[PDB]
Amino acid sequence: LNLDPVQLTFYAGPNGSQFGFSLDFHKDSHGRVAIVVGAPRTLGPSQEETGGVFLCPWRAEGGQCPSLLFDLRDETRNVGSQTLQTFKARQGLGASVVSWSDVIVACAPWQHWNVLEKTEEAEKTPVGSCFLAQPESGRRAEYSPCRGNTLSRIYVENDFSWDKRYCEAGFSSVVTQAGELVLGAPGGYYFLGLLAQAPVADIFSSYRPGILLWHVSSQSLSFDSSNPEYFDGYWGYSVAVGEFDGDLNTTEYVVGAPTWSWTLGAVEILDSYYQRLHRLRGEQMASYFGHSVAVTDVNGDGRHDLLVGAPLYMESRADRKLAEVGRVYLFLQPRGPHALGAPSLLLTGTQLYGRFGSAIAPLGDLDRDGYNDIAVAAPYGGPSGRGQVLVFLGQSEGLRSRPSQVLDSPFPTGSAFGFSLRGAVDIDDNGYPDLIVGAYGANQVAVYRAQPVVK
Amino acid sequence: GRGDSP
Amino acid sequence: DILMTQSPSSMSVSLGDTVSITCHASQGISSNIGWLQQKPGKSFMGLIYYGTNLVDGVPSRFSGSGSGADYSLTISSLDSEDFADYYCVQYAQLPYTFGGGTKLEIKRADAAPTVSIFPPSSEQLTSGGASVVCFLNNFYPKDINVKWKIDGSERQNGVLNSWTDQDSKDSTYSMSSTLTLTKDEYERHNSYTCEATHKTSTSPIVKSFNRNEC
Amino acid sequence: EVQLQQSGAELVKPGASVKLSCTASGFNIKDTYVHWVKQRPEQGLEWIGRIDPANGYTKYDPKFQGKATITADTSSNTAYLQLSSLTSEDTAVYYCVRPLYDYYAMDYWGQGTSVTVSSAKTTAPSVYPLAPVCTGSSVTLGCLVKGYFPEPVTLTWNSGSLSSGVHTFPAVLQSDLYTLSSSVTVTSSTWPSQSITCNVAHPASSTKVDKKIEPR
Amino acid sequence: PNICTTRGVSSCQQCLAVSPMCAWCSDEALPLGSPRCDLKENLLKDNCAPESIEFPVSEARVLEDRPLSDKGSGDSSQVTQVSPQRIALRLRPDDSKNFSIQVRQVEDYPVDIYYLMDLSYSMKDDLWSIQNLGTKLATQMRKLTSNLRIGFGAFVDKPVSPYMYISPPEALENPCYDMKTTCLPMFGYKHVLTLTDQVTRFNEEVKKQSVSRNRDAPEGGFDAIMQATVCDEKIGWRNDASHLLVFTTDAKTHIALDGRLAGIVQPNDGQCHVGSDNHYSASTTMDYPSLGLMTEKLSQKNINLIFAVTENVVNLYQNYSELIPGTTVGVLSMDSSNVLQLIVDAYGKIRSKVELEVRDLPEELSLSFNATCLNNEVIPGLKSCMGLKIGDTVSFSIEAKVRGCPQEKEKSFTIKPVGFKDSLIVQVTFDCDCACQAQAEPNSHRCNNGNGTFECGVCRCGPGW
Ligand SMILES: *[C@@H]1O[C@H](CO)[C@@H](O[C@@H]2O[C@H](CO)[C@@H](O[C@@H]3O[C@H](CO)[C@@H](O)[C@H](O[C@H]4O[C@H](CO)[C@@H](O)[C@H](O)[C@@H]4O)[C@@H]3O)[C@H](O)[C@H]2NC(C)=O)[C@H](O)[C@H]1NC(C)=O
Ligand SMILES: *[C@@H]1O[C@H](CO)[C@@H](O[C@@H]2O[C@H](CO)[C@@H](O)[C@H](O)[C@H]2NC(C)=O)[C@H](O)[C@H]1NC(C)=O
Ligand SMILES: *[C@@H]1O[C@H](CO)[C@@H](O)[C@H](O)[C@H]1NC(C)=O
Ligand SMILES: [Ca+2]
Ligand SMILES: [Ca+2]
Ligand SMILES: [Ca+2]
Ligand SMILES: [Ca+2]
Ligand SMILES: [Mn+2]
Ligand SMILES: [Mn+2]
Ligand SMILES: [Mn+2]
16 A cells, blocks of 8 residues: 555666575664575576575665675585585575574575485485574574485385485575574475474584584474375475464464375465464465465454465456466464364456466555555566566455555566565664565565555 | 386 | 594693693594593593584583694693593594593602502411512502512512502502412412512612511 | 483393493484494493484494394383393493484493403402501501402491591402402501401492401 | 337437337428338338438348368368358347358368377386377277378476486486486477378387486476477478377376476476477476466467376376366276277367357457257257267357447457367448438538538537537
8 A cells, every 4th residue: 555666775686696586674683674685596606506695784775785605615524434415506595585583594495415325325416405694793504404314225125205305495484483493395205395493593503514414403394294195295385484273382384385185285284393283275276375375464353364375376267268367365363273264365366377476475564554464476467467566455354355556567577576575574664664575587676665654 | 106106 | 444543642731731632543534533531430521523613511621623634632721620531533434433542640749659568367378378468559650560579589470460540639649469379389488579660769669578477 | 411321230141141221311312323332441442333213224343243233212212232142351331322413423422331241150258457567657557358259349447437548449350250459557656556447348248347457 | 109209319320229120211301290210111101202211221141151061081171161151240229130150070170199208217117008009099090080190299307306316427318227227318308200191100209219217206298288289380280180189197297386396487488499409498497387378379279188197197187177178088097998099089079069259259249149959959048069979060040239339330250169270250330320421411501501410301510519
C-alpha cells in the first residue's frame, strides 16, 4: 500500500555475479541496519566463479558495496591415512544468506568434497558448506555437516542408506531466535532431503581452519527413510521457523518438499526433534507446492499463520485449458491444539509463466493498521513479463484477496525481479518497515521505503 | 536403489 | 609406521621457566600432531591438537608450534602442576604412534645419599632365607649407582632395586636395593657391602657390616 | 561433561581372556571414534586400534591383530576391548580415548584400567624388621614386606602416628611375587627409647601383621 | 400494432434494430399517420412501393464446398476433411442464423513417429522393447497408413553434478567405471535418426545404441520432449501428417525448477538448441521445461505425445497425461494386448475424438452446438465426439446469435477441429443499414431549411446538433 515506488535505492554488483540472488537485513552491535547480499557467481582468485557476499551500508542513493571476505582456496588434509579435499569451484557462495544478531551466514550449496584412500574414494559430491562471519570482530567459522570420510564401496554394501554425499547443505537457511542455525539440504539421503541444525555459538567454538572434519556434538540432523513417498522430494528446498504447538519454550520448523510424493509436493511442520506435527499436501502435480514458505501472523490473533508458494500451479480456464500462473496458499493457525485445515485463502497468479508465489516475504505491519502484511513475487509476471511484486494486507479474516499495491520491475527483461524478497525491517528508521527486492538477473538490488499512508 | 539402476 | 623421536627424555627446571619440548617424525605429518600430559599417578589430559590448537580448558601458557617433521610444545612460566610426563602423538598415518615421552622434574642443589645397610632379620633367617637391605635416601640428582659386594667381591645376581618419585617438599629421590641370598649361602661369607656412586663425591660412599659380629 | 568410565582393575592368569569396557558419560558413545591405547613403564604408549560405534567398523595396529578385539554397544553406551591368549607382556594399563573436535585427534582419555597376568595365587606377605648394626646423631630403621600377591599393601609406622620422615618404596615383582620395603629416620634419642612398630596390611589375604623393631 | 410501431422509431437505422422482423418504408407517398416501422406485410397493405421496403434477411450461403476425401493417401495434401471450408454469414441486430459443418477422420492418412528413448542405465532390462522396433513398428501400422515415417532420439539427463558422476576422471568417459562393466559417457539429449520411411534405417540405428549411467533416478526426458518438438527441421515432422511423439522410460522424470539442484536457474526458453552435432547444447545451462510450456509447443507444432512407460510408473504418467490434454498412455510391460502395438492402440485412441475449436470469435457473436455422433444421434449443447473409428464422419449444427450491432461490419472467425489441418472460415457481415442511407441529402431543403439531413423519407438532425 504505502511503499514508495517513485524514489527507490539501487545497489549493484559485478556483472554476471548474480548479485541479488539472496539478501537479508543485518543489524550490528549498535543496531545500525545494513543489507547483506549474496552473489553466487562472483569471480574468485583463479578467475573462476566461486560466489561472494557483500555487506551494503544503508545510503539513500545506494551504489556499490564492499565484499564480506571469505576463504576461497581449495583445501587438502592428509590425515588418518586418508586425503580430505574441498573444492570451491562453482560452489555458489551466497546462494543463500541469513543474518542473526551480529552474525552473517552465507552458504555455498554446491561446494564439492571428496576423500581419497589409496585407489578408493568417497566420490566428489556437492555436500555444501556454510560460512559464518562476525563483521565487526572479524571472526570467521564454517559448518559443513554433510561431510564424511566413508568410502564409496561402503555405501554400496549398505544399500546407500544415510548417504549424505549430495546434501547441498545451505540450499536454504534459517536461524531461530535462540541462535540455532537450520540448514536445508534437498539432496540429503540420496535426494530425499534432510535438515541440519546446530547452535551458532557451537559452530564457532568448535571450528578451526585446516581440520575439515570436526565434531559439533550439539548438532542435529533429520532422518533417512525407506518410504518411496519421500524419494526425490527435495525435503529442505525451503525452510522457515515459527510457533505452531502452543508451547513457547519449543521452536517448530517448516520444511518445503516441492517434489514430495511423486511431484505432488508438500510442506511439513516439525518440532525441534524432527517429529512431524502437520503435513500439507500439494494441490497439483509439478506445481512445485513448497517452493517457498513463509511464517507470519496475518490476522492479529497472536498465532503464526502459514503461507505456501506453488509458482508453477496451472489454473483452470475456459474450454478445458490450463494456464501456468502460480499460486499461494494461506493457512491460519486454529485456536489451541488443532490441525491446520483447508487453505483459508487461495491467491492465484494472472500472468502466464509469471511464476506467482516464487517468493513470499512477511512485511510486518506496513500500513500500521494492526495486521501484518506480506509481499508475493512473480519474477516473470506483469504485462511486460519483467517481474512484479504484489503486496497483500492483513485483516481479521486473514488476508485481502486483492493486492493493496503492485511494484513493477525497474529493471530490464530477465532480471528475475522478485526472485528474492525481505521485509519487516525499518532500514531508514522512519518508523515504517521496508522492503528489499533482489534481481540477480540484473545483478542489482532495489530498496523500497515505506512512507506514511496517503489515503 | 533410489538411483539410476534396474 | 611413523617413528616419533621425542627429546629430551627429561629435564630439570624451576618455576617460572619457559621450557620447550621437541618432537621429530620419520617423515612429514602436516601438523597432524597432538600433545598429551600425564600427571604422576593419574590419567592423561589433552593439551594440543592439530599442531597448535589448545584443547578446551588448557591454559594459554601452553602452545604448540612447528611444521613438516619437527614440532615443539612450549610452556611459558612453569607452574607447580606442570611438572609431569608429556607425550606427543601423530595421527597423520595409521597406526597412530607416540613419542618416547618427557618428564619435567624440579631442579635444586645437589645432595649426597644417606646410606644405611641392614643385615637379615632373625625371623627371616630361621625361615631359610637372607636379605640385606640398603637404603640410599634423599639425594640429587636422580642419577645414582649401587654396587653390592660379598667379602669385597662384587655381586650382581639376586639384587632388587626400587626408586622413588621426586619427593614433594624437598625434591629429592631415594633408592632401595635388596640382595637376597639363601640362609646357607649367606653364612658362606662374612663381610657385606653396598657402595653408592653419586656425582656429589668422586669417591664412592661405602657402608658394610660383618656376620658373626656386631 | 565428557567422561569415560573404564572398568575396574583386572587380574587374570596366562592363557585367559579378559574384556575391558569404557562407558561414555555425558555424551553418546556413537558420536565419535573410540581408540584403545596400551601403556607400559618401559615400552611406553602403543596404539592398539579404534572403532566407530555407529557402524562398528574397526582398525588395528598389525601388532595386535588377533590379540585385541574392539567392539561397542550403542545401547549400553559402552565400548569394549577384549584380549585373548594373555601373557606376561600383556600386563599393562589400557586407556580408551576419543577426539574433542578434530575427527582424528586424541583429546579425551578414560581413567585407565590396570591389567595383570600372573599364575601366582593370593599369598600373604612376610614382614621383617630391619634394625641397624651395632652410633651417629640420627638413626634409620626399616621394614621388609616379602613374597605377597597381588597388590597393593598399605604400610604405616606406629599405626599412622609416625608420618613425616618416612620413605615407602614402590613394589617390585620378585618372580610372580611382590616385594616392598620402607625406611624411617629419627634422632638417636628417639630410638630405641621410643618404641617403633611396622604396620602392614594386605586386604587380599585379609591379614594385618605387625612387627616391632628390636635393636641388636 | 406491434413492438415496431409502439417503439416510436425516428430513423430506418433504428427501426431495424428493434427486432429482426421489422421493416422500414422510404416511400414518399405515404399516408398522413402511417408508421414507417412495421411488418413487411403491414407496409405493403398501405400501398407502400415494393422497392421502398427496407427489410434485410439473415442468410448463410457457402463459398467453398469441397467434398470430403475418401482416401487421405496420395495427393500433395489436397485432402479435405472439413466441409464446407468457407461460408458467408449475414446477420441483422439481435438476430441469429444456423449453419452446419462436417468433419471426417480420413482413412490412410500419413503418420510420423519419432521415438524418444530413455537410455539411462536403468533401461538395461527395457531395451528388449526397441530390439527390432523399426519393423515391428511398421507392420501393424501398414494396416492403417500407406505413408509412414519413423525417427528416433535418446536422452539421459543433464550431464552435470550431482546428476552426473564426476570422479574419478575415468568416470567421465565411462560412468560404469566403478563396476565390472563399461557404458557410454553421459548425454542430455541426442537426435539419432531424422524421420524417414526407410524402416531398416531405424533398425540399424537402434542396434548401434547403448545405455549410459547417471546418479539420480528421475531423468531429463522432458528436456528431450521439448527439443523434439521445437526442432521441426531436424526431427523432420511433415506439414500434412499425424505427428506421434513416443516417450519411453522406466522411471520418474525431472520437472521445471529441479535444475536448481545443479545451479541451473535459467527458465526454459522453448527455443531449439540442437546443433549440427545433434546434441542439446542448453542441457547444462537451462532448466527443465514446465508442463505448461511443453503443452504450448506440443499444441503449436501439433504433436501427439504418447507415454509408453513401464507399469511401475504408469500411474505417475497417467497423472501427467491429464495435465497435458491430448496425451495418451500405454503400459510397457512383457504382457498385454501387445507391448508396442501399444502405439497402434494409442493412435486409434488418438483418432477416436473430434472436438471443435473456435478462433477469433467476435465479442458480439455467441455460438451453440448440436453434435451428431455414432448414428444420427443428436446431442444438444455438445461440440465434441468420442468413440470414433478412422473413416467415420460426424456433423455439428451451429447457431450464431449476434448481440446488438457491432462497430465493424466485416469480421471473420474460424472453426477448426483440434489436431486437424483443415478448418471452416465463417465470413460474417453485419447488416444494420439501409440502401437509402448511401443516397441521403445533407443540409436538405426539406429539413428545417438546411438544418437537417433528408434520408429514407424522414428528416434527421444533421451533425453538430
Ligand atoms: C495419480 O492421481 C491419482 C488420483 O488423484 C492419485 O490417487 C489418489 O491418491 C490419494 C493419496 O493416496 C488418495 O487419497 C486418499 O483417499 C482416500 C479415500 O478414497 C482417503 O481415505 C485417504 O485419506 C487419508 O489420507 C489423507 C491425506 O491425503 C488424510 O487426510 C486422511 O486422514 C487419511 O489418512 C486419502 O485421502 C486417493 O484415494 C487417490 N485417488 C484415486 C481416485 O485413486 C495417485 O496418487 C496419483 N498417482 C501418482 C503416482 O501420482
Ligand atoms: C440444438 O438442439 C435443440 C434441441 O435440443 C434445438 O432447440 C430447438 O430448436 C427449435 C428450432 O426450430 C425450436 O423450435 C425449439 O423451440 C428448440 N427447443 C428447445 C428445447 O430449445 C436447437 O434448435 C438446436 N440448435 C442448433 C444450434 O441447431
Ligand atoms: C437451419 O436449421 C433448419 C432446421 O431448423 C435446417 O432445415 C436448415 O438447413 C439449417 N440451415 C442451415 C444453413 O444449415
Ligand atoms: Ca513451540
Ligand atoms: Ca494468525
Ligand atoms: Ca497491515
Ligand atoms: Ca522505513
Ligand atoms: Mn534411469
Ligand atoms: Mn528398468
Ligand atoms: Mn537422473
